[PDB]
Amino acid sequence: AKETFYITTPIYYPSGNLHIGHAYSTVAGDVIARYKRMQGYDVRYLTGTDEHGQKIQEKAQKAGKTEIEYLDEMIAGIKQLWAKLEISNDDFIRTTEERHKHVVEQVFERLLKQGDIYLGEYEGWYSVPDETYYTESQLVDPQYENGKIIGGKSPDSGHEVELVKEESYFFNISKYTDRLLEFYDQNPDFIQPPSRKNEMINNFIKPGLADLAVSRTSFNWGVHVPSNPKHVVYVWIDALVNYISALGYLSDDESLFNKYWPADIHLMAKEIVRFHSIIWPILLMALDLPLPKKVFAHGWILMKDGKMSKSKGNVVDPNILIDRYGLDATRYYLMRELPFGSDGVFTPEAFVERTNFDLANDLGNLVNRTISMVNKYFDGELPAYQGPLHELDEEMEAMALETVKSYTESMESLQFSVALSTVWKFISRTNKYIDETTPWVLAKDDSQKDMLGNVMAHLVENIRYAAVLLRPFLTHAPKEIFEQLNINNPQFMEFSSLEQYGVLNESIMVTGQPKPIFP
Ligand SMILES: N=C(NCCCCNC(=N)NC(=N)Nc1ccc(Cl)cc1)NC(=N)Nc1ccc(Cl)cc1
Ligand SMILES: N=C(NCCCCNC(=N)NC(=N)Nc1ccc(Cl)cc1)NC(=N)Nc1ccc(Cl)cc1
Ligand SMILES: Nc1ncnc2c1ncn2[C@@H]1O[C@H](COP(=O)(O)OP(=O)(O)OP(=O)(O)O)[C@@H](O)[C@H]1O
Incomplete structure (x- = not known):
């Protein structure tokens, strides 16, 4: 049977619109969720909203609405944003739901009773x-x-x-x-x-x-x-119990709670780590419940000489970034630019640089060059992998294996920017391999057709490795890459297919009409 893995974001406070700060936590949780699913875990990924308090009451009153009217609107917009980011959350917890309120009440009365x-x-x-x-x-x-x-x-x-x-x-x-x-x-x-x-x-x-x-x-x-x-x-009690109330704790059906609790990881920024590391375990102790296995407190996206904050208005809207630059770009930037643990400043220039140079150029040009060469030199029919025929292949094939190994270590320690940079070293190498092998020169000589085919085979396999490793991060590009290469075997899109280099040992007809992978 599949081992369970339960991951959460904080429940966000809808006193204003969410910004890329909130998207950072939620995309990061999604990457972990998607990664763990690919590793064969039975995953549950929770997010939600923290909806009580005088601030919400005030915001509702200023907008001429009841609290629940105001909240239903704000939450609809938040849910839209997660759908737009393609967040793979299995549930969305609202503290206004009865399933939550029932837990808060029962917990409070229990603690009263216990003294x-x-x-x-x-x-x-x-x-x-x-x-x-x-x-x-x-x-x-x-x-x-x-x-x-x-x-x-x-x-x-x-x-x-x-x-x-x-x-x-x-x-x-x-x-x-x-x-x-x-x-x-x-x-x-x-x-x-x-x-x-x-x-x-x-x-x-x-x-x-x-x-x-x-x-x-x-x-x-x-x-x-x-x-x-x-x-x-x-x-303290209201917000923290979301992580258990969402699982039907103290309800008529505790099956999700019995299956998934305790949480493998609570995700958050550093300003609420103390509440999840001190108050939360203590509350769980008062309830004689298992404690979470890990609290990860990442750093801050900064702007205008301070933490990005919906109160201060020093914000970047993720909806604008997705509309202008596309989804993959947005998700990539969030996970790559800011190392998971440190703080960093957002700039438009760093965003465009990061996304144009890495995605459209390095990865996009690699796939374009490769498919167009297969179309030109073999009329679309990619020759099957045979072995490391070129003098550079043994070392490059070893790099493929080491890329996976290093990536895994980075992913397990939650160093997402490092995992990505490691994948990109391999992508960059693959572009260099085109320059080194000069396939256009090999295409002039009929005796070199086998070697040319081997170069093509190695390019596609390298691309396939990158695409698989990117599946947790980018929701559009890997699928598009598989479709254009016409790799249809679903097993060749999974981590286990990266154990031994050179899985494509039957010829494949690639796309005759390739297009850019991005945006
Ligand atoms: N600095 C803080 N000090 C404590 C006062 C918080 C009041 N302001 C809020 N924005 N409350 C809220 N998010 N929720 C809330 C819920 C219920 C009620 Cl009755 C009132 C407020 N807290 C904070 N910035 N956030 C926070 C988030 C999660 C947890 Cl577990 C703990 C604290
Ligand atoms: N087994 C325990 N484990 C916690 C490891 C030490 C935590 N890290 C520190 N950076 N603590 C500190 N400089 N000081 C510190 C002082 C008091 C308290 Cl209550 C906690 C930490 N602690 C314990 N049972 N009480 C404790 C009280 C006094 C001292 Cl000298 C050490 C531990
Ligand atoms: N600038 C940021 N960088 C990284 N994560 C953030 C940022 N802002 C918000 N988050 C995420 O959302 C959680 C709660 O942050 P919060 O909504 O309080 O920030 P805020 O927008 O400044 O709100 P407020 O203005 O009410 O303090 C954090 O623990 C983190 O998971």
């Missing part, structure tokens, strides 16, 4: 322009009155903050500290990249985990605490 949660008062300091609450120790220019902080400025914006006090339920998370830290020791690959771990534990665990305010009373757009409905469940 994990107790009633108190939340105190904080709100900044309007930051839309952020701060603790008193975070405030700049604290103003004192009889030894007590009665005011200050936000450390981000410098704006005057306002005191907030409201009845709130608190989650005792500190009692799980030793268990959490033991989990980290036993599972060294849990936090990825491991460079994230030190800072996170130094700043957030070392000083002591404060009791966590897990409800609010000052607004009503949220999952209501059944036994105390003036309280709504705040972000």
Whole structure:
């Protein structure tokens, strides 16, 4: 039987339109999902939306709509975007669905019953322009009155903050500290990249985990605490349980949950790694549930000297990139340009360079040159592979095998840009092999027809390798390449067909009417 593999993106907050930042996470998850499917895993890939809170309530009111009206529109547009990116997600979780709300309610009541949660008062300091609450120790220019902080400025914006006090339920998370830290020791690959771990534990665990305010009373757009409905469940419990509620946890059919939980990987950017590495495992401990195997926190797409953000408006719309440059281009750029773990700036120039030089030129010209030569020299009939007949073949065939091996290692460690660059070294090599072998010279001599056929056979096999390896990344080009080469055997499109070079040992009629693979 097939081993399960369960991967998630964060549930995104639809307070504005999604941008290439969000597409980065979602395409990255899709690449992993598609890769794991090709490796023979039974895959489930989840994404969704985080729909509660005062900000959504405010956005809806400003737009003259109810919350659910506003959300249904925003989510329709998000679902359109994923369809347009050809995301292979098996489900889409909305926190407004009853299947989700039921879990949030039951989890909260269970924690109340166990004594994990107790009633108190939340105190904080709100900044309007930051839309952020701060603790008193975070405030700049604290103003004192009889030894007590009665005011200050936000450390981000410098704006005057306002005191907030409201009845709130608190989650005792500190009692799980030793268990959490033991989990980290036993599972060294849990936090990825491991460079994230030190800072996170130094700043957030070392000083002591404060009791966590897990409800609010000052607004009503949220999952209501059944036994105390003036309280709504705040972000921590509401958003985090999506990963299990989507699987029918605590429903009448827990089969998806029993099959796929625990998650093999939660994907996210670095600004929410602490919530998925501290609060999330602790919540799962309170429920006596298995912990996720890995949390990967990638870096940020940057622009205008800062993180791309729908609040700041420093954004690039993925819909515009797809319409202007095509789908493969967009997906390729996202996975290739920014190494998975580091930060990087978006520029239009880097986008066009990356996509024209690598896709249309290196790969596109390779396929065009190859097919046109087969058409010219053999009237479309590609001679069957025989062996490494040319003096360069043994080493190039060895490169094909090493390309696969290296790619695999890069893919397993989630270094997508490296996997891609490795594929492209082989693509570039294959173009060079045309220059080195000069097939047009071989075509003049009738005695050289066998060698010419061998050169053609090696070009197509190299192309086939590249096309297979690109299937997780590019959804259009590999299929197009297979069609134009007229490789119909579905087995020759799978990873296992890359074990031994030279699978095409019957002649094939390539396309008589080739066209550019891109855009
Ligand atoms: N910096 C943060 N501090 C905590 C306050 C968050 C309030 N702002 C939100 N944008 N809330 C939301 N995404 N959701 C939300 C859900 C329910 C309710 Cl009642 C209110 C808000 N959080 C954050 N930026 N995002 C976040 C995302 C996922 C998780 Cl698991 C945790 C935090
Ligand atoms: N960078 C560090 N990495 C984490 C060390 C490995 C965690 N494993 C445990 N088996 N920790 C423990 N039971 N507790 C623990 C407590 C004190 C110390 Cl000296 C070490 C571990 N930590 C650090 N520099 N200080 C630290 C201090 C207090 C706490 Cl609660 C957590 C971390
Ligand atoms: N600039 C970015 N680079 C990489 N990933 C991003 C970026 N922006 C968003 N994401 C993805 O979406 C998740 C949530 O980000 P979020 O929507 O809060 O960013 P935002 O657009 O700045 O929103 P807000 O303006 O409300 O902070 C991240 O954890 C990540 O998976």
